[PDB]
Amino acid sequence: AEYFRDEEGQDVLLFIDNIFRFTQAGSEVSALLGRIPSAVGYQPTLATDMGLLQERITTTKKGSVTSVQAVYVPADDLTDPAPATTFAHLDATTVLSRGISELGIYPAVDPLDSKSRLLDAAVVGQEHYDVASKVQETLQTYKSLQDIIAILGMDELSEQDKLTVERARKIQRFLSQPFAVAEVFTGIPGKLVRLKDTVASFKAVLEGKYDNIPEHAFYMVGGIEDVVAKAEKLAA
Amino acid sequence: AEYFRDEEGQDVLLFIDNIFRFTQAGSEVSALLGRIPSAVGYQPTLATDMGLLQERITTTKKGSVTSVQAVYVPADDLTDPAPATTFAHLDATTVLSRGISELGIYPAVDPLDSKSRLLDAAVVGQEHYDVASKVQETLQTYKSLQDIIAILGMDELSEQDKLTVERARKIQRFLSQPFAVAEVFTGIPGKLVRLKDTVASFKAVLEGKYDNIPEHAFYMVGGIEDVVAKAEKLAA
Amino acid sequence: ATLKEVEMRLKSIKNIEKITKTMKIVASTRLSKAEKAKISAKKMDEAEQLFYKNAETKNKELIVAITSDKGLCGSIHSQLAKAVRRHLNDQPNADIVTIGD
Amino acid sequence: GEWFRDNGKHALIVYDDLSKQAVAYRQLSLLLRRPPGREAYPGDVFYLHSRLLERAAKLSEKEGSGSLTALPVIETQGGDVSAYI
């Protein structure tokens, strides 16, 4: 990577599946070396060894390198020292969790455990941020009330909460997007939506303008236009 | 304190702050002393070290030294093994309450979770005990009715219950008195209230004959003379 | 964390139990006033019913429905509604008077 | 920051993040045989952190108004505060 960035002076990309194996490999060697474990088995030279790597993928005036890293985690504990210190050296993250895979919604990136420094009101527009803001709020209310919902019905719940929830369930299912490289697996032909298109589709859907048609119309389809087509399909 | 007790034979009063910093300190030098700790990293020599200090602070046929030791509860859990060991080693525990501090009431002492070596029976005087007993009950009622007051408001509370609620609010705000060291804050000089005077006034409110002093009018008061005065002042 | 997120949510469920507990004790008080009142009402009614049999019970429609303004009554609100709506099929433009929020 | 404070100019110090200083000193201590406290950084790091923070102060007016102010930062992984650090 360094040779492309520098010598040929071209921008690069990097993929790793999985870079957890890198921290794991250290911990194995560490014991025998004469070093003693830092906490829960892992090498005490963990912080330094992560650090050096993530500064050597860095962005200069000679090339800038966009990276995609897949971190493996045992039983999804993220309070552990190895997943945790990587998140600081990442400007944006897309935490992928088991629940959203059980919901039958691939992709499985959690929407409520996502962060970005790339999402601002002038980095991608004021408008882009306000459409994303509203998605974030809606699902966080819907989660707040999962307890209450289960304990008692929605007729014993508030009418106001029920709008947020009804919006939120539809918005969760809408997040889905079958893939054209796992067309087989998904069971549905792949779809793609542009960045510009994506905001628009979510903007409308939030204001109630396309909440009134099935929650399965939003399951496993891409942008807004695919949902309207799937409704026709459903209707027959 | 040892010198006062002993040689000249004078009575004193000890005061220490925070005694969690002492407990904490030993846990460190045990560990740096190359000695395995107990669980949660604390010193395994805590019991015999706390005991050596405590035994020393005692009445002897020469003098009397009496500690009031501030203790800090780490992360508001008092079952953590280093705090749980010490609890027994302190004869007369007081629980302090963030909620009560915040509500504006001062002291922050919890009126149902205040204990001491000399409490109740005729130890503290028979009159005194029975008065303290009615108050313990009275708060407790308010805490129970609070579930009724919250949704229903009035639909099972009695004429009697409402009157029990008033007495409770009034005893509740009769635990707030101004502090001489908070003239820099509050701006109202301190109060010294004899044993008799507290026992008597508190008794009066309970008979239903000081339910003629408004509820807020027990907030920041002293003795009997002040409570009477504050009713006239607040009414007009 | 994990620990604390279990622990706070558990408090929610515990507070909810206390509120549902208290409310159910109180329900038991109201049901008795509700029954006493029902007896006297039903008995007054019975005297016109003697009449209505002997008269022969015989024959836009109106719909009336009966609820309290308070909620938490389980599926009374909507089951009763569901029977209002079923008979809303026998005329779409029927005037419904709703007794209770 | 302290040189300012002594000369009579105020300052303010951000220690971002103290948790990672403890991760450093924990690795360092482990290599030097200094054993982890409630944080893998060794227990005398309560000594490291207490000494550092009380060095931000307010002096008197025979010794200048200047005060260094401190904002210590501890980053908790899911808000976990019963940890040693």
Swiss-Prot record, chains A, B:
Present with 164000 molecules/cell in log phase SD medium. The modification Phosphoserine is found at residue 101. It is found in: Mitochondrion; Mitochondrion inner membrane. The chain holds residues 273 to 508 of 511 of the full protein. This is ATP synthase subunit beta, mitochondrial. Belongs to the ATPase alpha/beta chains family. Mitochondrial membrane ATP synthase (F(1)F(0) ATP synthase or Complex V) produces ATP from ADP in the presence of a proton gradient across the membrane which is generated by electron transport complexes of the respiratory chain. F-type ATPases consist of two structural domains, F(1) - containing the extramembraneous catalytic core, and F(0) - containing the membrane proton channel, linked together by a central stalk and a peripheral stalk. During catalysis, ATP synthesis in the catalytic domain of F(1) is coupled via a rotary mechanism of the central stalk subunits to proton translocation. It comes from Saccharomyces cerevisiae (strain ATCC 204508 / S288c) (Baker's yeast). F-type ATPases have 2 components, CF(1) - the catalytic core - and CF(0) - the membrane proton channel. CF(1) has five subunits: alpha(3), beta(3), gamma(1), delta(1), epsilon(1). CF(0) has three main subunits: a, b and c.
Curated annotation (Swiss-Prot), chain C:
It comes from the Eukaryota. It is found in: Mitochondrion; Mitochondrion inner membrane. Mitochondrial membrane ATP synthase (F(1)F(0) ATP synthase or Complex V) produces ATP from ADP in the presence of a proton gradient across the membrane which is generated by electron transport complexes of the respiratory chain. F-type ATPases consist of two structural domains, F(1) - containing the extramembraneous catalytic core, and F(0) - containing the membrane proton channel, linked together by a central stalk and a peripheral stalk. During catalysis, ATP synthesis in the catalytic domain of F(1) is coupled via a rotary mechanism of the central stalk subunits to proton translocation. Present with 28100 molecules/cell in log phase SD medium. PubMed:12898710 reports two tandemly repeated copies of ATP3 (ATP3a and ATP3b) on the right arm of chromosome II in several laboratory strains, including S288c. This has not been confirmed by the yeast genome sequencing project. F-type ATPases have 2 components, CF(1) - the catalytic core - and CF(0) - the membrane proton channel. CF(1) has five subunits: alpha(3), beta(3), gamma(1), delta(1), epsilon(1). CF(0) has three main subunits: a, b and c. Belongs to the ATPase gamma chain family. This is ATP synthase subunit gamma, mitochondrial. It comes from Saccharomyces cerevisiae (strain ATCC 204508 / S288c). The chain holds residues 34 to 145 of 311 of the full protein.
From Swiss-Prot, chain D:
It is found in: Mitochondrion inner membrane. Coiled coil: none annotated. Changing residue 1 to D: In ATP1-2; growth-defect. F-type ATPases have 2 components, CF(1) - the catalytic core - and CF(0) - the membrane proton channel. CF(1) has five subunits: alpha(3), beta(3), gamma(1), delta(1), epsilon(1). CF(0) has three main subunits: a, b and c. Mitochondrial membrane ATP synthase (F(1)F(0) ATP synthase or Complex V) produces ATP from ADP in the presence of a proton gradient across the membrane which is generated by electron transport complexes of the respiratory chain. F-type ATPases consist of two structural domains, F(1) - containing the extramembraneous catalytic core, and F(0) - containing the membrane proton channel, linked together by a central stalk and a peripheral stalk. During catalysis, ATP synthesis in the catalytic domain of F(1) is coupled via a rotary mechanism of the central stalk subunits to proton translocation. Belongs to the ATPase alpha/beta chains family. Present with 41500 molecules/cell in log phase SD medium. This is ATP synthase subunit alpha, mitochondrial. It comes from Saccharomyces cerevisiae (strain ATCC 204508 / S288c) (Baker's yeast). The gene is ATP1. The chain holds residues 291 to 375 of 545 of the full protein.
